[PDB]
Design an enzyme around this catalytic site. Structure first.
Site, PDB file in Angstrom:
ATOM      1  N   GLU A  48      -3.797   7.830   7.755  1.00 51.26           N
ATOM      2  CA  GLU A  48      -4.450   8.490   6.634  1.00 51.26           C
ATOM      3  C   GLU A  48      -5.624   9.313   7.144  1.00 51.26           C
ATOM      4  O   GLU A  48      -6.168   9.059   8.222  1.00 51.26           O
ATOM      5  CB  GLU A  48      -4.915   7.482   5.576  1.00 51.26           C
ATOM      6  CG  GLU A  48      -6.085   6.619   6.004  1.00 51.26           C
ATOM      7  CD  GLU A  48      -6.324   5.460   5.060  1.00 51.26           C
ATOM      8  OE1 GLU A  48      -5.489   5.241   4.156  1.00 51.26           O
ATOM      9  OE2 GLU A  48      -7.351   4.773   5.217  1.00 51.26           O
ATOM     10  N   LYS A  76       0.821  -1.207   0.000  1.00 50.89           N
ATOM     11  CA  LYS A  76       0.000   0.000   0.000  1.00 50.89           C
ATOM     12  C   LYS A  76       0.857   1.260   0.000  1.00 50.89           C
ATOM     13  O   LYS A  76       0.538   2.241  -0.683  1.00 50.89           O
ATOM     14  CB  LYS A  76      -0.938  -0.017   1.207  1.00 50.89           C
ATOM     15  CG  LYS A  76      -1.853  -1.229   1.253  1.00 50.89           C
ATOM     16  CD  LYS A  76      -2.844  -1.128   2.398  1.00 50.89           C
ATOM     17  CE  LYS A  76      -3.791  -2.316   2.413  1.00 50.89           C
ATOM     18  NZ  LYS A  76      -4.508  -2.466   1.117  1.00 50.89           N
ATOM     19  N   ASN A 102     -16.637  -3.944   6.039  1.00 48.80           N
ATOM     20  CA  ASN A 102     -15.824  -3.434   4.935  1.00 48.80           C
ATOM     21  C   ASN A 102     -15.761  -4.423   3.772  1.00 48.80           C
ATOM     22  O   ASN A 102     -14.729  -4.553   3.111  1.00 48.80           O
ATOM     23  CB  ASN A 102     -14.414  -3.067   5.404  1.00 48.80           C
ATOM     24  CG  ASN A 102     -14.400  -1.845   6.298  1.00 48.80           C
ATOM     25  OD1 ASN A 102     -15.096  -0.865   6.037  1.00 48.80           O
ATOM     26  ND2 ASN A 102     -13.605  -1.898   7.359  1.00 48.80           N
ATOM     27  N   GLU A 144      -6.067   2.188  -3.612  1.00 46.14           N
ATOM     28  CA  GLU A 144      -5.703   0.834  -4.028  1.00 46.14           C
ATOM     29  C   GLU A 144      -6.013   0.570  -5.501  1.00 46.14           C
ATOM     30  O   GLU A 144      -6.956   1.135  -6.063  1.00 46.14           O
ATOM     31  CB  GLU A 144      -6.404  -0.204  -3.140  1.00 46.14           C
ATOM     32  CG  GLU A 144      -6.032  -1.653  -3.433  1.00 46.14           C
ATOM     33  CD  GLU A 144      -6.780  -2.642  -2.559  1.00 46.14           C
ATOM     34  OE1 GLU A 144      -7.592  -2.204  -1.717  1.00 46.14           O
ATOM     35  OE2 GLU A 144      -6.552  -3.861  -2.710  1.00 46.14           O
ATOM     36  N   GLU A 151      -9.943   1.655  -7.356  1.00 48.91           N
ATOM     37  CA  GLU A 151     -10.983   2.133  -6.455  1.00 48.91           C
ATOM     38  C   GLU A 151     -10.744   3.595  -6.103  1.00 48.91           C
ATOM     39  O   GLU A 151      -9.612   4.000  -5.827  1.00 48.91           O
ATOM     40  CB  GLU A 151     -11.024   1.291  -5.181  1.00 48.91           C
ATOM     41  CG  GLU A 151     -11.404  -0.164  -5.383  1.00 48.91           C
ATOM     42  CD  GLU A 151     -10.922  -1.048  -4.248  1.00 48.91           C
ATOM     43  OE1 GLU A 151     -10.254  -2.062  -4.523  1.00 48.91           O
ATOM     44  OE2 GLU A 151     -11.196  -0.721  -3.074  1.00 48.91           O
ATOM     45  N   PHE A 207     -24.645  -8.548  10.874  1.00 48.68           N
ATOM     46  CA  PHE A 207     -24.810  -8.310   9.438  1.00 48.68           C
ATOM     47  C   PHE A 207     -24.187  -9.433   8.614  1.00 48.68           C
ATOM     48  O   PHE A 207     -23.560  -9.203   7.579  1.00 48.68           O
ATOM     49  CB  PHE A 207     -24.232  -6.951   9.041  1.00 48.68           C
ATOM     50  CG  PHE A 207     -25.152  -5.800   9.315  1.00 48.68           C
ATOM     51  CD1 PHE A 207     -26.524  -5.963   9.242  1.00 48.68           C
ATOM     52  CD2 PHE A 207     -24.646  -4.560   9.661  1.00 48.68           C
ATOM     53  CE1 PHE A 207     -27.375  -4.907   9.498  1.00 48.68           C
ATOM     54  CE2 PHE A 207     -25.493  -3.500   9.921  1.00 48.68           C
ATOM     55  CZ  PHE A 207     -26.859  -3.674   9.838  1.00 48.68           C
ATOM     56  N   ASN A 257      -6.548  -2.918  -7.786  1.00 52.04           N
ATOM     57  CA  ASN A 257      -6.569  -4.370  -7.884  1.00 52.04           C
ATOM     58  C   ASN A 257      -5.864  -4.829  -9.153  1.00 52.04           C
ATOM     59  O   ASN A 257      -6.122  -4.321 -10.247  1.00 52.04           O
ATOM     60  CB  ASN A 257      -8.006  -4.885  -7.863  1.00 52.04           C
ATOM     61  CG  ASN A 257      -8.622  -4.820  -6.487  1.00 52.04           C
ATOM     62  OD1 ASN A 257      -8.673  -3.760  -5.870  1.00 52.04           O
ATOM     63  ND2 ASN A 257      -9.097  -5.958  -5.996  1.00 52.04           N
TER      64      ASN A 257
HETATM   65  N1  LIG Z   1      -8.898   7.001   3.522  1.00 53.93           N
HETATM   66  C1  LIG Z   1     -10.126   6.507   3.708  1.00 53.93           C
HETATM   67  N2  LIG Z   1     -11.152   7.373   3.865  1.00 53.93           N
HETATM   68  C2  LIG Z   1     -12.381   6.885   4.052  1.00 53.93           C
HETATM   69  N3  LIG Z   1     -12.777   5.612   4.110  1.00 53.93           N
HETATM   70  C3  LIG Z   1     -11.743   4.778   3.953  1.00 53.93           C
HETATM   71  C4  LIG Z   1     -10.418   5.130   3.753  1.00 53.93           C
HETATM   72  N4  LIG Z   1      -9.623   4.001   3.633  1.00 53.93           N
HETATM   73  C5  LIG Z   1     -10.471   3.009   3.759  1.00 53.93           C
HETATM   74  N5  LIG Z   1     -11.769   3.405   3.956  1.00 53.93           N
HETATM   75  C6  LIG Z   1     -12.933   2.544   4.133  1.00 53.93           C
HETATM   76  O1  LIG Z   1     -12.479   1.215   4.343  1.00 53.93           O
HETATM   77  C7  LIG Z   1     -12.968   0.351   3.294  1.00 53.93           C
HETATM   78  C8  LIG Z   1     -11.911  -0.666   2.942  1.00 53.93           C
HETATM   79  O2  LIG Z   1     -10.971  -0.060   2.031  1.00 53.93           O
HETATM   80  P1  LIG Z   1      -9.890  -0.924   1.271  1.00 53.93           P
HETATM   81  O3  LIG Z   1     -10.294  -1.172  -0.127  1.00 53.93           O
HETATM   82  O4  LIG Z   1      -8.530  -0.251   1.445  1.00 53.93           O
HETATM   83  O5  LIG Z   1      -9.844  -2.275   2.102  1.00 53.93           O
HETATM   84  P2  LIG Z   1      -9.099  -3.677   1.993  1.00 53.93           P
HETATM   85  O6  LIG Z   1      -9.517  -4.613   3.053  1.00 53.93           O
HETATM   86  O7  LIG Z   1      -7.600  -3.387   1.917  1.00 53.93           O
HETATM   87  O8  LIG Z   1      -9.553  -4.171   0.553  1.00 53.93           O
HETATM   88  P3  LIG Z   1      -9.231  -5.331  -0.494  1.00 53.93           P
HETATM   89  O9  LIG Z   1      -9.882  -6.606  -0.077  1.00 53.93           O
HETATM   90  O10 LIG Z   1      -9.740  -4.790  -1.834  1.00 53.93           O
HETATM   91  O11 LIG Z   1      -7.701  -5.402  -0.531  1.00 53.93           O
HETATM   92  C9  LIG Z   1     -13.364   1.292   2.163  1.00 53.93           C
HETATM   93  O12 LIG Z   1     -14.375   0.710   1.347  1.00 53.93           O
HETATM   94  C10 LIG Z   1     -13.878   2.513   2.927  1.00 53.93           C
HETATM   95  O13 LIG Z   1     -15.224   2.342   3.357  1.00 53.93           O
HETATM   96 MG   LIG Z   2      -9.993  -2.682  -1.659  1.00 53.03          MG
END
Ligand SMILES: Nc1ncnc2c1ncn2[C@@H]1O[C@H](COP(=O)(O)OP(=O)(O)OP(=O)(O)O)[C@@H](O)[C@H]1O
Ligand SMILES: [Mg+2]
Ligand SMILES: CCC(=O)SCCNC(=O)CCNC(=O)[C@H](O)C(C)(C)COP(=O)(O)OP(=O)(O)OC[C@H]1O[C@@H](n2cnc3c(N)ncnc32)[C@H](O)[C@@H]1OP(=O)(O)O
Lengths: 673, 247, 261
Positions: free
Chosen positions: A206, A122, A241, A294, A281, A354, A296
């Site tokens: 962040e 990341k 999430n 991110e 995304e 949920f 994909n």
């Molecule tokens: N900087 C941000 N500001 C606001 N919401 C955020 C932020 N970063 C993450 N989120 C929230 O967290 C969720 C998860 O984000 P992200 O896609 O980074 O997760 P992940 O578990 O790493 O995903 P993946 O399975 O695609 O690798 C987002 O959909 C959003 O709701």
């Molecule tokens: Mg993601």
């Protein structure tokens, strides 16, 4: 789909589930022979039957069956596999896997290793995005290592702070804080949990955008540098999430923002030298400001929905790109054709957190494929077993239409005409979401489940008219069953005198209230009288089909009679939610008034093992109180595990059924107080 | 409810290895009309299942082995539970359907001292004396004299089927190997050659002890057909005041 | 050369000797008679008519087709006779030949005798000395048991049926004696158990021998399977004749009447 175009002759799918079925379908359409890997458990899965031939990988666990690169490579070598499609997950982003493939001769249907390693981490992804002069979330470049540094970062970037563990994903390793003390405690907890979850231990502060909209741009790149952005999609609806409801045409976002985001995505893809299919995304705030989050480097799970609007087959394009052909489409050709909505059907209880992953075997399974504008991506067949080793997926339901309203109506009809019996699914949650006023209007965000249902999912709240319709349908079904019970064949020795009852006076007990219903029959039309209101119910009254369609005062409703008992209990699915009713005759209710309630506390203080065996799991500890019917211990015998429970609320005096104990039949295990 | 409805969910309900158990009430629910089953004595002697259901609208009596409880072994209580139900179904012209998965009789000293022989003979007699239509389906194991008891074709049974997981043998392949090849004392390939020709329903099929090796998904339809053909069954037996059942 | 007559006489002398002189000596050392001696004691002198003397088993697996595994009669002597002038059908199981294990031919002979008995209306008396089911015969053996079982259930209430256990009896060789009207045993030499003691130790883990697991004392005092137990073979057969004098020959005949003083 040009048979003249000579692509690879054989393709091996390195994934399981509905994605394997998708790849096999598109390969059979495009002409490629397909070989499918499967574990011992999934030896009878759908994708094994769909594939031309199959090769077993080994034991049930995913870490040993699909994550074992050596087994995958020997399977490839034995079967003369020319190409490989990893789908999403498992070895989709496995660097050493692709290294071995490039080592022997094997082509990888997907991006190059450089893009994989660039977008895997990341922090470096954000660094490249900064180098890619694209909009990014406010944050501090570098890895936070101490609490004081974290709180200082919180100082310059603002109190809204989110710690994210580097690498990984799936809604894990992310904590939200708002204060400096919250910053530091979230930091220490994230540092502690990173090793347990990911092991990178790298942490990033962040800025948290308030009520973000999670838009996604699908990108298709070839080996010649041509990158195309195929419209957009919205995945705001999330729990834990994780995506549940997925809309292809974004309603909040407009053409100018679409073009800007597409240009940024294409520029970044050219920067990364991405020469395959993927997604980017973005988070869009209220002021139409989009921030990168991110990229994909694999086939997105929700790819099919955009396939409904673009009219393109993404997997076929991936295969052609892997061959080396340039893209046959231009930026102008792609268009938004209609509207498309996707609901991800999981095998989990929507009434708890949920969605709580459940297990079971499907006794009945029927998809609503006969309804118009319905596509069902599933790797499920009747008899399939939901295991603990795999993602509790059931299917993906997609509806397409001219506009949003038609697509939502088709989704509602499809969900109402969808038969799953054997596990607990989240169909009720999906249908209740798609009919919400906020969702229809479009005011949605990433907190839709949380803010809409603060107490959690409770089912559909039926109104007075809907309550009357439900009561009328239930009473009509009861009377229809009673009337069918009188249709014996002729005896000719003792002739049957069918009763000539004209009106049925019933008491129906829905939830807690009791309603007096008067029903009459005139053939296929039941005239029902519920608490003054008069309704007409008509249907074919086929009492054996899983789905029953009834017209009540013109309104057409599809209902399922899940359970029925001679005592009067009836569990019936109406508008997605399963309601329990108790229908009695009037005299039966009057006499039942005398019956005394049986308190069901039980004692079960001395609980005994069912059969002699080793106790794999112990759910109780001495000094811990249990509840009525609360699970006590899971014991295996003949490697058959039974989870025997307690009967009454009582503190555990002593656990004699400890893990590994070979307690015999009828032996003292747990003493209750 | 159509009489030709398929039941694909039964195609893999039987685990391929012989160590896991399964719920036969699931099979019974899948086969019968509207998945409605009236179970008799559902909490006593739970290694056997008896009840009333309907096939094509006609009342049928159902007897089956439960591999979950006591691995499906027959004992005194299960035998006396099944015997009288079979007798009542016979006495009032009710067809019988049997699901067979039984490794044998439950061993032990208590069973021997309780008179397991008499009570097993009760069920054997109950099945042998039946003059109503009888359909039998073997889902897995049928070992030893238990196979004789559980409504064999040899007891004037009408129609018998076997699932591809069935296994009819005098005993398990292992003990049969140590008892037949005791002298050879080298079983490394002997067991392999034994289980390749006897650990499958072929020995029973090629001698005509089962009418067909059907697929699990076609069970219900097949049964319905039989119940439409055997409705007019009539047999004649020698005259007697009554028979001396081992009560 | 007219070898057919000498073949017939050799087959006769082999059938009359069971499966060998050494095995007969072992049987006598155990205190047990042979099947033909039992039939001679049970029936009236010069009234035994034997059936299926030359019948041989059709098994051709696991080296059962060799001449050393071809015993005529096949471990059962079946026929008819008379007790005090009244007709009876009898079968006696020979422990010498393959331990008295029941094969296809054994079942055919027993079913043939029982079919004649049910046709004429005469009782059946069976002396059980079987060591279980012939494993080499395979499912055929099982099938044979079921056939016998069916006929028992068909003959209940029509003709009297009597069983005498004079040796070990295990596996599915226990249901047929239980389906008959009366069961007698011989003390210290007869056994009756579905499952042997070794498997009992293997499964439910307790030490028990054959005597208190299937012995005559056990099945005549605390199980109710057997009706009476006799001291030895001769006493058992004499008491069996005395008992058979009581019963009628068929359900059609009335109660017997003797001369009274
Ligand atoms: N900087 C941000 N500001 C606001 N919401 C955020 C932020 N970063 C993450 N989120 C929230 O967290 C969720 C998860 O984000 P992200 O896609 O980074 O997760 P992940 O578990 O790493 O995903 P993946 O399975 O695609 O690798 C987002 O959909 C959003 O709701
Ligand atoms: Mg993601
Ligand atoms: C799950 C379903 C099941 O449980 S199937 C159960 C079938 N298994 C069996 O072993 C049959 C039961 N028989 C027995 O247990 C024993 O033979 C009993 C009845 C205890 C006899 O005791 P015992 O006096 O010690 O016998 P023995 O060793 O002196 O006699 C040896 C001769 O008899 C024979 N014999 C014995 N059993 C079988 C058999 N099942 N199949 C074929 N032959 C058998 C032996 O082959 C041996 O032959 P021979 O007469 O010496 O030539």
């Amino acid at each position: 789909y040009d048979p003249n175009e000579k692509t690879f002759d054989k393709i091996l799918v390195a994934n399981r589930g509905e994605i394997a079925c998708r790849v096999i379908r598109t390969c059979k359409k495009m002409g490629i022979k397909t070989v499918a890997i499967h574990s011992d458990v999934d030896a009878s899965s759908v994708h094994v039957k769909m594939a031309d031939e199959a090769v077993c990988v080994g034991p049930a666990p995913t870490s040993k069956s699909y994550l074992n690169m050596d087994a995958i490579m020997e399977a490839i070598k034995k079967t003369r596999a020319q190409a490989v499609h990893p789908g999403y997950g498992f070895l989709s982003e496995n660097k050493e896997f692709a290294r071995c493939l490039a080592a022997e001769d094997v082509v990888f249907i997907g991006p190059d290793t450089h893009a994989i390693q660039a977008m895997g981490d990341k922090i470096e992804s954000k660094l490249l995005a900064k180098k890619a002069e694209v909009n990014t979330i406010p944050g501090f470049d570098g890895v936070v290592k101490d609490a004081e540094e974290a709180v200082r970062i919180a100082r310059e970037i603002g109190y809204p702070v989110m710690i994210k563990a580097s690498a990984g994903g799936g809604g894990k390793g992310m904590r939200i804080a708002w204060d400096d003390e919250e910053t530091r405690d979230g930091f220490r907890l994230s540092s502690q949990e990173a090793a347990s979850s990911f092991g990178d231990d790298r942490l990033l502060i962040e800025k948290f955008i308030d009520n973000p909209r999670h838009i996604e741009i699908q990108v298709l790149g070839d080996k010649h540098g041509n990158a195309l952005w195929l419209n957009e999609r919205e995945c705001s609806i999330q729990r834990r999430n994780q995506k549940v409801v997925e809309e292809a045409p974004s309603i909040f976002l407009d053409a100018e923002t679409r073009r800007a985001m597409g240009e940024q995505a294409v520029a970044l893809a050219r920067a990364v030298k991405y020469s395959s299919a993927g997604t980017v995304e973005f988070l869009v705030d209220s002021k139409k400001n989009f921030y990168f989050l991110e990229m994909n480097t694999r086939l997105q799970v929700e790819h099919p929905v955009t396939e409904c609007i673009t009219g393109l087959d993404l997997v076929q394009e991936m295969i052609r790109v892997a061959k080396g052909y340039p893209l046959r489409h231009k930026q102008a050709d792609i268009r938004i054709n209609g509207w498309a909505v996707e609901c991800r059907v999981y095998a989990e209880d929507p009434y708890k957190s949920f969605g709580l992953p459940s297990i079971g075997r499907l006794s009945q399974y029927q998809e609503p494929l006969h309804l118009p504008g319905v596509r069902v991506d599933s790797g499920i067949q009747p008899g399939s077993d939901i295991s603990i080793y795999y993602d509790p997926m059931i299917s993906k339901l997609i509806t397409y239409g001219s506009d949003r309203t038609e697509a939502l109506k088709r989704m509602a009809d499809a969900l109402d005409n969808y038969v799953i019996r054997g596990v607990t699914h989240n169909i009720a949650l999906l249908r209740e979401v798609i009919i919400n006023s906020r969702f229809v209007k479009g005011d949605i965000s990433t907190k839709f489940l949380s803010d809409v249902y603060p107490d959690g999912f409770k089912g559909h709240m039926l109104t007075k008219s809907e309550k009357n319709q439900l009561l009328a349908i239930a009473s009509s079904l009861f009377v229809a069953f009673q009337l069918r019970a009188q249709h014996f064949q002729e005896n000719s020795r003792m002739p049957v005198i069918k009763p000539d009852i004209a009106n049925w006076e019933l008491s129906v007990k829905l939830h807690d209230k009791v309603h007096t219903v008067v029903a009459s029959n005139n053939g296929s039309v039941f005239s029902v009288e519920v608490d003054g209101s008069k309704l007409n119910v008509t249907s074919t009254w086929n009492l054996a089909s899983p789905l029953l369609s009834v017209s009540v005062d013109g309104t057409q409703r599809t209902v399922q009679c899940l359970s029925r008992e001679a005592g009067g209990n009836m569990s019936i699915q109406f508008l997605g939610t399963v309601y329990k009713v108790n229908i009695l005759t009037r005299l039966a209710a009057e006499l039942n008034k005398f019956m005394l309630e049986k308190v069901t506390e039980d004692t079960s203080s001395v609980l005994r093992s069912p059969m002699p065996g080793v106790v794999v799991a112990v759910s109780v500890k001495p000094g811990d109180a249990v509840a009525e019917g609360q699970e006590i211990c899971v014991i295996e015998a003949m490697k058959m595990q039974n989870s025997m429970t307690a009967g009454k609320t009582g503190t555990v005096k002593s656990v004699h059924c400890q893990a590994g104990d070979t307690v015999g039949e009828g032996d003292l295990l747990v003493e209750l107080e | 409810d159509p009489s030709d409805r398929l039941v694909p969910e039964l195609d893999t309900i039987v685990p391929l290895e012989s160590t896991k158990a399964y719920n036969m009430v699931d099979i019974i629910h899948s086969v019968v009309d509207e998945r409605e089953f009236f179970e008799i004595m559902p909490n006593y002697a739970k290694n056997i299942i008896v009840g009333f259901a309907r096939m094509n609208g006609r009342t049928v009596g159902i007897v089956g082995n439960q591999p979950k409880v006591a691995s499906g072994c027959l004992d005194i209580n299960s035998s006396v539970k099944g015997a009288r139900f079979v007798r009542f179904c016979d006495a009032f012209n009710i067809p019988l359907i049997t699901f067979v998965d039984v490794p044998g009789f439950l061993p032990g000293t208590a069973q021997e001292y309780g008179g397991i022989i008499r009570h097993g003979a009760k069920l054997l007699y109950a099945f042998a004396e039946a003059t109503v239509p009888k359909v039998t389906v073997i889902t897995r194991k049928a070992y030893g004299g238990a196979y004789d008891v559980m409504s064999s074709k040899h007891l004037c049974g009408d129609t018998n089927y076997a699932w591809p997981t069935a296994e009819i043998a005098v005993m398990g392949a292992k003990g049969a190997v140590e008892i037949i090849f005791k002298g050879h004392e080298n079983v490394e390939a002997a067991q392999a050659e034994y289980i390749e020709k006897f650990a499958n329903p072929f020995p029973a099929a090629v001698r005509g002890f089962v009418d067909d090796i059907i697929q699990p998904s076609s069970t219900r339809a097949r049964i319905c057909c039989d119940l439409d053909v055997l409705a007019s069954k009539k047999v004649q037996r020698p005259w007697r005041k009554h028979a001396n059942i081992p009560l | 050369a007219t070898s057919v007559n000498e073949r017939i006489e050799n087959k006769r002398r082999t059938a009359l000797l069971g499966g060998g002189q050494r095995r007969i000596d072992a049987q006598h050392k155990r205190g047990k008679l042979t099947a033909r001696e039992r039939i001679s004691l049970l029936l009236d002198p010069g009234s035994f008519v034997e059936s299926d003397m030359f019948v041989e088993h059709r098994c051709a697996d696991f080296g059962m087709a060799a001449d050393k595994n071809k015993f005529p009669g096949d471990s059962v002597v079946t026929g008819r006779g008379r007790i005090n002038g009244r007709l009876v059908y009898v079968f006696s199981q020979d422990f010498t030949v393959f331990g008295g294990s029941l094969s296809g031919a054994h079942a055919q002979k027993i079913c043939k005798i029982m079919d004649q008995a049910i046709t004429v209306g005469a009782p059946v008396i069976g002396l059980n000395d079987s060591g279980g089911a012939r494993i080499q015969e395979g499912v055929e053996s099982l099938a044979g048991y079921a056939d016998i079982f069916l006929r028992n259930v068909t003959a209940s209430g029509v003709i009297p049926q009597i069983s005498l256990i004079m040796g070990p009896c295990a596996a599915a060789a226990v249901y047929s004696p239980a389906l008959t009207d009366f069961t007698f045993m011989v003390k210290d030499t007869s056994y009756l158990f579905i499952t042997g003691p070794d498997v009992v130790k293997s499964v439910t883990n307790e030490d028990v021998t054959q005597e208190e697991l299937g012995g005559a004392k056990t099945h005549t005092t605390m199980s109710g399977v057997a009706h009476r137990a006799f001291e030895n073979d001769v006493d058992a057969l004499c008491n069996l004749r005395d008992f058979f004098n009581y019963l009628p020959l068929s359900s059609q005949d009335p109660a017997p009447v003797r001369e009274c003083h």
